[PDB]
Point group: C2
Chain length 256, copies 2
């Protein structure tokens, strides 16, 4: 079967991270949309204009709003992208055939929206040469960050080629997790986000979303299906692109 995949990058990244996977999915006959989120990739906004993870998700919400009735998509989120999935599913949960989490946060409906991010920061407290700043938006102080190049090299793109790592150095931008805003956000709903089918894809060789964290997430909120990819690194859509495509084909064949 063919699906319409909507690929959703993590914070400080852009659609460009999916530059290998997108053509491969298309070569399998799928429609693929790879979005830049607010203040990401070639989006014209700067992060200091963005006050929440919800506002950050605008391009995804807008895209879903523009789907004609009856058209469903499979959302694929990497790393912090699982939060954008949760947000989208609580607005457009009739449009979502399934969501695939790709070394991603997996929010739940029983704890506050910041819950898995708070846990991530316990398990991986040291972001190496990553720099931080503060800005104010909508009366709240928000912590912005710029991922450090050594963190990028060693922990996110560990096994990626120099030309891929170079793209990350060139294209990664200031971003934010909006952790304090998430902490005060209404919980994700059981009827929207809770109802969607959730496929959890991971590698135990991920050097930032470490096994303790990913296995903790799986036990905390049981996915409908789990796929464990052998080897690779955190950016499986670069290091294990063919394997990710294979998994996504199976998802397309399973959930509609």
């Amino acid at each position: 079967a063919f699906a319409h995949f909507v690929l959703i990058h993590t914070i400080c990244h852009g659609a460009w991270i999916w530059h290998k996977l997108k053509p491969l999915l298309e070569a399998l006959g799928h429609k693929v949309t790879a979005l830049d989120l607010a203040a990401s990739g070639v989006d014209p906004r700067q992060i200091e204009e963005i006050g929440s993870f919800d506002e950050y998700s605008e391009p995804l919400l807008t895209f879903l709003e523009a789907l004609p009735p009856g058209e469903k998509v499979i959302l694929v989120g990497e790393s912090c992208g699982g939060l954008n999935i949760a947000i989208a599913a609580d607005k457009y949960c009739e449009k979502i055939a399934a969501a695939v989490f790709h070394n991603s946060v997996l929010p739940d409906t029983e704890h506050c929206p910041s819950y898995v991010v708070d846990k991530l920061m316990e398990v991986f407290p040291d972001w190496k040469d990553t720099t931080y700043f503060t800005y104010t938006k909508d009366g709240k102080e928000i912590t912005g960050l710029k991922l450090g190049f050594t963190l990028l090299r060693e922990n996110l793109y560990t096994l990626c080629g120099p030309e891929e790592y170079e793209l990350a150095k060139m294209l990664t931008r200031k971003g934010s997790l909006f952790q304090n805003i998430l902490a005060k956000r209404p919980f994700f709903t059981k009827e929207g986000y809770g109802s969607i089918k959730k496929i959890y894809v991971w590698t135990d060789q991920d050097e930032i979303f470490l096994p303790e964290f990913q296995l903790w997430q799986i036990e905390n909120y049981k996915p409908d299906k789990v796929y464990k990819v052998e080897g690779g690194d955190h950016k499986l859509q670069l290091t294990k692109t063919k394997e990710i495509a294979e998994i996504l084909q199976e998802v397309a064949d399973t959930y509609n």
Copy 2:
């Protein structure tokens, strides 16, 4: 010898085009700077804010201004990047060891600055699915363009992999040649731009800067050295990356 290479993308592109060449040059021991020009790549400006090729070149001029006395660079420009070189050399010609033109326009000092662009449009008049718009800045109507995806595929990235072409679809942005502004611009000077060493690199398999054009440019304004790369396509920094690095090493060893 080692040099400091400053790599300069064409219109509608960004530093990202150099993502393969930059690490290779670095693996030879060079310092490499790959800039986003105004309203290009991750630069925060939109093109409608930019009134001239000179204003477009600001990030390059600013970068050159920030070089401490005595430090010289080798400028490397692709496609329309030769115009940014001319502009820079007329402000900072003591800072420039040489300029390498990479399937690039080669402005001169005898004809108006638009001369080689006017000629390019004669030789390659049909930009396929490229779209055009007009905006007004500083009292002048400027023609903006968005390179068409079929033009990209067939003429710029002809022999590049699908994953490279995908980057171009994701990252290329609205731009302008500022052709009418160039036409009224003061000529490039003999003392600045005219004095710099100029190395002309090309392939006769380029499907946009066709042989008639490139050979016309070489005869119009004799380069100090010409290198012809066999095969590849217009984006030689993607299809012939190792060959471009080899040439640039030789340039570094020749001109300081």
